[PDB]
Design a protein around this ligand. Sequence first.
Ligand SMILES: NCCC[C@@H](N)C(=O)O
Ligand SMILES: [Mg+2]
Length: 399
Amino acid sequence: NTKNVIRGKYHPEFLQNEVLADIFAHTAQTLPDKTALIEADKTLSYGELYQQALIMAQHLALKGVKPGHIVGLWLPRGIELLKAQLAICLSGAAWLPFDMDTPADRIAVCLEDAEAVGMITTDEWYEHLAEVPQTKWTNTELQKPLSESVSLAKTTPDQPAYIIYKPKGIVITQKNICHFLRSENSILGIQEQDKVYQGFSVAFDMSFEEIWLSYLVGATLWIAPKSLVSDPERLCQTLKQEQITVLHAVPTLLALFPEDVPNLRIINLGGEMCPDSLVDRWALPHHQMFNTYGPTETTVSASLELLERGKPVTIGKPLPNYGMLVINSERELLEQGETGELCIFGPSVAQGYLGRPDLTADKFIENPWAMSVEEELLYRTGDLAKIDEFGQVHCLGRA
Ligand SMILES: NCCC[C@@H](N)C(=O)O
Ligand SMILES: [Mg+2]
């Protein structure tokens, strides 16, 4: 019996024998005629999206892409970016996402580091990649008709699903991300009826909360243009105009909203702990306001907190099947109250840092207190924390 190890709810059924392609293919076959993507006035259905991405994936397979390969992704915000991400996924490979504003030299560095077999871009952007040695395919050429269908080798849960980036490549597995999706959505509860704002760059974790939760339940995505992403008041009006029901964002953006958006079902605030003033402003009755915390090394999020006016803001309790404990300099578990390094365990702990066994073995360590085979690996956040007399974890800055 120990009050110094804090777990999320027990849900072994969130650990399935699945991969991202399985989740999306299920959603697309179940709701082919449902609209999946919205870009201004263009709309694509789940069935249309699935077929187009499958054609692109067969083209990747023809060009030599197989499960376990890493494919760079660099396209403008929009339907084509998401379709290309999905095409990489359907091919069985993991994608390395690049923000719109990534300099070509950084792209080259990341592709080299990951040993990527190639990357997807557009014709317009293809010219900008002269100094990139790796193979560069255009969505256009990958969308050409095929004279015969190509069988796609399936990938395994232990294979990478994506790699998030001097550069540190964090390797997230199919297992990691599929479990994270099911775990967080058991609490958030994104529904198929929802209309979800898609404003994050695919290089950030919260883009997964936007896109792939929606894929999981078949919600509809309204993809924000680059112009809108930097205009909080124009965005505050756009959310009302399009009647978006789900918004993932960081506290500062919400704090820059002039009025309320009453038609927002769920408000998931990542990035930073929400200030009390923003809670009192937005934790309204017709709003379910959440604050999600977690390092990229444990798949998007690790804990989630339901915000309420007058309830002090904390990082919440771990997500289902996630766990948190506090250790000291000697890598040994501390009794409650005595502060130390916050560590996270569970099935969504990343594989580690790509091609850097030194640092990986330094920060991903054996868990001597695992109560199952999914808890055998602790990621040391580098944060300092303590468990209070309420079983709640409190962050206390960096080490
Ligand atoms: N919901 C989590 C917020 C995003 C944070 N994990 C990050 O590393 O960017
Ligand atoms: Mg991090």
